[PDB]
């Protein structure tokens, strides 16, 4: 392809339907987006296990063999943003102890198996942006106590079950904006700490989520494009660190005199 002095080989621009053969087992990064890899062969990456970034994008990746990712203990960032694989790969992923960023957003995702995200201990960010999910994965997320960012942006989630985000105490920023959340239970966020950003932008909420006051750390709070009529008095009480509340584009009726104190 095109080797770089930074050990960042970019093979985007060959259109090849397999892994780049003959490449030195010394490279660190690998970018392949122009090409179309309809299937990842078994142990196709055994040649160069000394990589840390794997930019596999835009490929119509429909299948990835369970053993295909074995032995990549030096991999740090895995990017699979635009693909066609349906279910989250729970067997290919399981076996990575140095992975920090798992991007699986554009590939349509209807289901996610229970044992998914097992053994991952260095995960800090993972994207699930545009894929038709309907239930927030509770047990699957319970195995990730070390992440600091999680986006569920474009899905068809309906509601957040109680204690759906409990184990991942080290979370920082959450995104749930452009889906269609209908109502939240009053214990959905219980257990979340040092959370800063929370987005509920376009999901139409009924009246107001009272579960916000469960987190003592909070700086932003995005809920604007939804349909909120009345904000109850003293709603922003347990979160005295707010600095930006996006509440435009709501048919508000009665904010209430006691609605903003010591912010």
């Amino acid at each position: 392809c095109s080797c770089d002095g930074d050990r960042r080989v970019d093979c985007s621009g060959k259109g090849l339907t397999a892994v780049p053969e003959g490449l030195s087992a010394f490279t660190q990064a690998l970018d392949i987006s122009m090409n179309n890899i309809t299937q990842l062969p078994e142990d196709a990456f055994a040649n160069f296990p000394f990589l840390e970034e794997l930019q596999l994008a835009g490929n119509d990746l429909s299948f990835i063999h369970p053993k295909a990712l074995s032995g990549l203990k030096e991999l740090k960032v895995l990017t699979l943003q635009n693909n066609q694989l349906k279910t989250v790969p729970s067997e290919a992923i399981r076996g990575l102890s140095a992975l920090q960023s798992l991007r699986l957003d554009a590939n349509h995702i209807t289901s996610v198996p229970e044992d998914s995200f097992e053994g991952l201990v260095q995960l800090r960010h993972l994207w699930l942006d545009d894929n038709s999910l309907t239930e927030v994965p509770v047990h699957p997320l319970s195995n990730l106590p070390t992440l600091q960012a999680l986006t569920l942006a474009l899905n068809k989630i309906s509601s957040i079950p109680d204690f759906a985000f409990t184990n991942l105490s080290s979370l920082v920023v959450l995104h749930l904006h452009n889906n269609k959340i209908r109502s939240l239970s009053q214990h959905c966020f219980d257990g979340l700490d040092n959370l800063e950003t929370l987005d509920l932008n376009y999901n139409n909420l009924g009246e107001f989520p009272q579960a916000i006051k469960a987190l003592p750390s909070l700086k932003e709070l995005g809920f604007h494009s939804n349909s909120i009529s009345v904000i109850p008095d003293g709603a922003f009480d347990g979160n005295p660190l707010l600095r930006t509340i996006h509440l435009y584009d709501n048919p508000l009726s009665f904010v209430g005199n006691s609605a903003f104190h010591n912010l």
Partner: nanobody
Amino acid sequence: SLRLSCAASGYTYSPYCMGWFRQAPGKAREGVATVDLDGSTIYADSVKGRFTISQDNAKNTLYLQMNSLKPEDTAMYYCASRTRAGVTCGLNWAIFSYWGQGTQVTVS
């Protein structure tokens, strides 16, 4: 009207979520029939009443029988198995750890 047998030698015993996958040459691969250790089977919409699935834990051998052959059914069929439990069954390729070499199947 074919016999598709999967000689299970990978694990030692206790089969779990034995499933058959047909692969189309250019598209993804999806399941057609999956049985569990208890014997419960899950087919697809285009398979219920057309094919079947048979598995014996005594000889530890997976059997697949085709019926009502049709031209669209011709594909590259694969055998899949799972050892570690903890996942609900279903026609999904993300939950199986061992994949057979696969056989190409036509109609006549």
